[PDB]
Design a protein around this nucleic acid. Structure first.
Ligand SMILES: [Cl-]
Ligand SMILES: [Cl-]
Ligand SMILES: [Cl-]
Ligand SMILES: [Mg+2]
Ligand SMILES: [Mg+2]
Ligand SMILES: [Mg+2]
Ligand SMILES: [Mg+2]
Ligand SMILES: [Mg+2]
Ligand SMILES: [Mg+2]
Ligand SMILES: [Mg+2]
Ligand SMILES: [Mg+2]
Lengths: 189, 187, 189, 187, 190, 190, 190, 190
RNA sequence: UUCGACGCGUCGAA
RNA sequence: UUCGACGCGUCGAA
């Protein structure tokens, strides 16, 4: 009797949404903690927090058997995961676009985009500490991310989430960071 | 090469989105025509449009392999179709909740609630025409749909979308119809 | 250390909000069921459901020790409780403004206002069943609720919730129901 | 007679709301003046305004007997006061989270975050004036406030209101300040 | 010293706004009161309220010297007062379009238009109670107000605020009240 | 030298635009006035106003030379002109979708949909005057317009813009009017 | 007979309103033009445009006879006129809050707050031209206006309307300008 | 039969909109590509893209027969194309304001204004790589664009879309790039 | 008052 | 946007 199939499926969904949300939130917390740790210098516990995030990502992936919901609310957490990963990889001098996760296209793309910001932050504090090498390396992975990711601008925005906006922000950041680099060079004399 | 997998999946999703949209639009056009036809008397021709809509729905059932879209896209046409089916069932004395489609829960629920206003317009036409038995029937199914759907209001709004609102509006319609029936009976 | 007092109080609040919301939601379900039952004729199980509501209201009142939140989210449930009660009392021919519950002024007032609608629904279906007595008595409690409640219009709206709007709706309903009464009289000949 | 109890409570609540509003407005005026004064150099006079604000806050502490309002009304003036306190602490080398007020959690958190912008404007003035040690200090406390507040972002937005946003904006401010400090050092 | 002038004029405007709002709200309370009394049957008490209201309008009038704020603020109360006067007049067999107050064209027109529905309410309650004569009278003043007011409907809405919506409502009320009257009339041949 | 031709075209468009705006505001005002006037039972005067409107429409059509701005701007007022025409046509016994003067597709469709509401007012006031046959005819045209215009929903918005929303409003109006018409069927008796 | 006087005043207000609108749109256009012109380094032409604006302000002030509509409407354009004047004054070495022609309090305050941003553009283009002293002066005035105008926040909005938002924007502008000025201090060298 | 005419013109407009959008988006893709290539150093491949784009514009031009829709639709692509052309021209030492395309004043002006920032990016990357001569050249074309474009800033915004904001950004970019250049210059005496 | 849509202006990421 | 807000001017909804 159809109404009871409704009631059933709605109870299932309410439950799933609650649990999923819990998991996704824990994942996000670990991603964020990871990023902050990397800014702080502690890359070891950054890798720890990261591993925690990914295990939780398997737990998250468990809920794909609820297509309605799922995709409407995975993105943010997924983005940060990618962001955090790319970010660690950049500062470890092992940056790759070859991150293999069961994540949505929008989230992959956008996570990479988001890393550009963290990179600007990093490159800027290193600029201040006098470490021009790390800065110019950061710069380089930034420009790489932008340049490669712009290729997906050709898609209708709705499919590719907030990609054009984020990339325009990135571009502004890259210019600011280059100016800062030059300024830091001339400053330190 | 990862990014290339992205590119490929986005090319697919774009294509799909476009065709799904086209098909959903056809489906909706048929649903709508069926409804307007029932209002116009042409109840059999209405049945034809409904049949078409349902076939097109078989064609829509293809795209669930794209869950990244699909639901988001299908909602409106879906609930439209449920509306048309419920309206047709109702006007022809065969009203039931037991329809075989599936159809997402919100689409289902919201379709039935949507039917209530259609039933009011019908009921009111019948009233002007003098057919009181028809208006009484419609009134009965309106009342039924309300009483029954209201049970699902326990749920968090998000999961069931606009349900509570659409129901309030329905209630309003039912009352206005009861009034319209009381007058007209003064004739 | 202040930050820890923050963290503590926020964990407390998140919890309380969750629980409170559950309780309130159950209360609302019983109120609503009560009302529908009364429309259906089954006033006995209406009184049952009602009693369930009120016990749950004691449970609700438990959370007053969280002033922030609480008042931001009690209203709706409280309103319906009052509404439901007034509604039962009207159709039992024992209508009173002397309902004694620990409930907010806005909710008391607004619940009574809301009853007017249920009453129009009721008086209308009785109008159709031929029962003019019940209808005119309903009408009378309607007009009573409006006239007594208008006296609180003198307050700034924010304090008295959606009172003016609801009362204007009520007034429209009263006029519609009177017209219906006359029309039902002449119809029935 | 119930309804009369309602009438009474509403008369009280109205009176209170009016008074509370007046007092909060006073408090906020003093907070604001204290901040602008610190920006202008007059750091002691600023201290005076801050003292006034806090006394007025003792007067505000009366109205918690009206929980039906109070919080809703107090939020803005509260977080503004926390902002002024944090800013004053910071500019005078005595920055700490340990302030004795309470003050609701969101008001607290959001007040500190709000301080970051004030610290940027200050830092930038100091920069133009040549006082690098001051900008370094401000930069340090901006960084601290960010690092520490960010921990509270775990919480559901509602409970902590605009925190995540105000922090993003803060981050932005900190970066722009770091840039402004790198230039100016080229002199 | 233009900033100090700003400060002066702003202080005055602030004060005036507080006082004016307090007065206005008293006037509106009294008007609403008198209308409710009229429905309630207590026409003398209604008269007293109407009187305290009209008394208040003299106080309100003092604020014309602040034209920024004055016309924006006075509208609802003025309209409400006009409504109460036209309504009371209607039921006392003394209906007149010659209400001579210092009030805006908007408040005047809108007040009568508003009175139309207060009248529908009245006419329906008399109709229930078997008092057909009262109903017929009310319906006549209703129709007269509609008829006289419909010509201002060519003026730009901003100049005559909600006039068209009000008159729409009036139209419907008239239609419904006529119907109700006729139905009740047949109803009392049995 | 291109920058030059830019400055030239730009100046031309500035001036045209200002004029086109003035003329459109006038045309729109006269159309509205005409409809209001019909409702105020001043049919002749309404005729005059509609004349002034249609005469402005030629001054307007002069600006098709500037397609960078003509279609973007002309919409509202052309909608209003269609509404006024369709309405006059309907109450004048000869209702038809054949009004010879275009006008963009969307303004035509929107204008008719809009006219549905004016028809509602008119039918209501017929009902009040006791002219049931007239109100019947109005209901009929209203329904017709709804039925024919619904066929255009299939097209995308933007291209057709406001239509869906307008038509929903219209549907509401029609039903409301039916309800009122039913309420009046107590005559019939007397 | 009151309905009569209504019709009269209403007609008067209709006509006045249309004219007042036309004159305000003009005055506003000329003020904006003047500011634009200064930025385009055409200072004399900007002088002309400002003249045309101030001359329209008298045509405008004729309408104070209609306080039902005067203050509601004049706001925007009087704000733009203040902005243009304050701006011209500042870049012309004699900045002062003493501009002799009023104008409502809120339009004055808002106009100056508005002028802060134009000052930002100007200081930026000075910086580009290498005139650091000039940009310094601009920074100083900007800061002054911010400081003085903040003292008016205590008042309620509405009375002061847009001020708080404008001033926040202004604060942002000032800081941005400071940052730019700092970035330029690499000259200094050469 | 006016409804059937509506249906016809609407069908045509719908089709045209689909086709046009497809074309426009191809042109835009190509322009964006050519710009990215220019930054990437691959100026020949950039030239090829620019060529495919300009080829497309000939297709786009065919849609002028649908003025409803045409001008609303073509703006962003046209602007993007102009930007790409002016940018490529700038780095190839062949900068010219004489770009002779059938394109709106808005697209033209806005395209150059847009190119300013693309230029700032370029100038900064050469500046990093020690190529001071390229930077100086870029800064010169930047300043020339700003200077000639600033006079259109007197035109109403709607007629010349985002021109003001674009030029604001330009101003700042110029200011920053000058600073950067000077800083890098001192930086290479060590 | 509340909401939405269009046009006219000014902001902001703005 | 494009996007978000403000105010004027129109028009519809509650
Ligand atoms: Cl570090
Ligand atoms: Cl029953
Ligand atoms: Cl060409
Ligand atoms: Mg991040
Ligand atoms: Mg339907
Ligand atoms: Mg209820
Ligand atoms: Mg501050
Ligand atoms: Mg009234
Ligand atoms: Mg109309
Ligand atoms: Mg300006
Ligand atoms: Mg670009």
């Amino acid at each position: 009797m159809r109404l009871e199939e409704c009631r059933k499926r709605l109870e299932e969904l309410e439950a799933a949404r609650e649990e999923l949300l819990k998991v996704l939130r824990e994942m996000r917390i670990h991603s964020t903690k990871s990023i902050a740790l990397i800014h702080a210098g502690k890359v070891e516990e950054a890798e720890q927090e990261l591993k925690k995030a990914i295990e939780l990502l398997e737990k998250v992936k468990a809920y794909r058997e609820y297509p309605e919901i799922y995709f409407y609310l995975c993105n943010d957490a997924m983005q940060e995961l990618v962001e955090a990963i790319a970010f660690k990889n950049a500062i470890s001098g092992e940056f790759t676009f070859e991150i293999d996760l069961e994540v949505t296209p929008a989230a992959f793309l956008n996570g990479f985009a988001a890393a550009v910001g963290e990179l600007r932050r990093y490159a800027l504090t290193k600029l201040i500490e006098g470490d021009f090498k790390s800065a110019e390396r950061m710069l380089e992975v930034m420009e790489k991310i932008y340049e490669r990711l712009m290729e997906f601008t050709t898609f209708p925005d709705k499919l590719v989430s907030g990609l054009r906006k984020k990339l325009d922000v990135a571009r502004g950041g890259i210019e600011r960071t280059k100016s800062d680099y030059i300024a830091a060079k001339v400053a330190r004399l």
